């Protein structure tokens, strides 16, 4: 029990309720990029001239479990192995064995100002109660030990990586991880709409391919962690 436990539970339950829903039959979501089972959608949303476009993607990744996908997404010690858009990050606070608060700065995308972010990152298993599900939620929080960074505008995020595992002695050949990934990012102040939209459209599919291939590579030949 840390001070965020109730907020974590609300965020995780909202994602389980609303984020997991299939959007294939929902014309409100625009399917923007498809590469096999990887499907990336957005809604075009602006608030006060600032792009907020919600992002939602699904993927089906052979040979890894939801638990493993979530561990590698959450574990800061492997972060620099797959992340390509981060300049710096610092763990600000350790709340629990499954929850931390992170500060990070993103590489600048000309001509917009650099952004930074301050967020809680939590990894949770949700029992079947139906598949079991593993979820990582990353969502912005306020913290006193946030640095002064005069180069950066503070973005706010609510991201979840939600994973369900299907299985046919069990082999990697017989396992598939189904991922739903959602990201709602407020860039904080102004940035050109065309730039934000092009960064999203490029960087989200690149991340999902890169990150899922990395998990496949790191786990192959290791005992399966369900
Ligand atoms: C001007 C920057 C806006 C901007 C700030 C931040 C983020 C962002 C933050 C966190 C996460 S994550 O999945 O929680 C993994 C931990 O980092 C992904 C994305 C995305 C954008 C928008 C631009 C989109 C984007 C997508 C992917 C990578 C970088 N940028």
What structural class do you assign from the helix and strand content?
alpha+beta
> What is the assigned CATH homologous superfamily?
START domain
Q: What is the count of DSSP helices, taking H or I runs of 4+ residues?
A: 4
The first-level CATH class is given as Alpha Beta
Bound small molecules, which ones? the ligand CCCc1ccc(-c2ccc(S(=O)(=O)CCO)cc2)cc1[C@H]1C[C@H]1c1ccccn1
Number of domains: 1
Element pattern in H and E: HEEEEEHHEEEEEEEH
Q: Output the radius of gyration.
A: 17 Å
Strand tally: 12
CATH topology: Alpha-D-Glucose-1,6-Bisphosphate, Chain A, domain 4
CATH architecture: 2-Layer Sandwich
Taken as a percent bin, the fraction of beta residues is 35-45%
Helix content: 10-25%
Distance between the termini: 25 Å
PDB class: lipid transport
Keywords: lipid transport
Assembly: monomeric
Entry title: Crystal structure of CERT START domain in complex with compound E14
């Amino acid at each position: 029990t840390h001070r965020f436990v109730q907020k974590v539970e609300e965020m995780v339950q909202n994602h389980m309720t609303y984020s997991l829903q299939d959007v294939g039959g929902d014309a409100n979501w625009q399917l923007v990029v498809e590469e096999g089972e990887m499907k990336v959608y957005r809604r075009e949303v602006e608030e006060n001239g600032i792009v907020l476009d919600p992002l939602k993607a699904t993927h089906a990744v052979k040979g890894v479990t939801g638990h493993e996908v979530c561990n590698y997404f959450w574990n800061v010690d492997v972060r620099n192995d797959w992340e390509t858009t981060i300049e710096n990050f610092h763990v600000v606070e350790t709340l629990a064995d499954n929850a931390i608060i992170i500060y990070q700065t993103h590489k600048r995308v000309w001509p917009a100002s650099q952004r930074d972010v301050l967020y809680l990152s939590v990894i949770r298993k949700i029992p079947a109660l139906d598949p079991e599900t593993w979820i990582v939620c990353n969502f912005s929080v306020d913290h006193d030990s946030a640095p002064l960074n005069n180069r950066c505008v503070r973005a706010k995020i609510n991201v979840a990586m939600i994973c369900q595992t299907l299985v046919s002695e069990i082999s990697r050949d017989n396992i598939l991880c189904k991922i739903t990934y959602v990201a709602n990012v407020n860039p904080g102040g102004w940035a050109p709409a065309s730039v934000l939209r092009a960064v999203a459209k490029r960087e989200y599919p690149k991340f999902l391919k890169r990150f899922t291939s990395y998990v496949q590579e790191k786990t192959a030949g290791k005992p399966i962690l369900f």
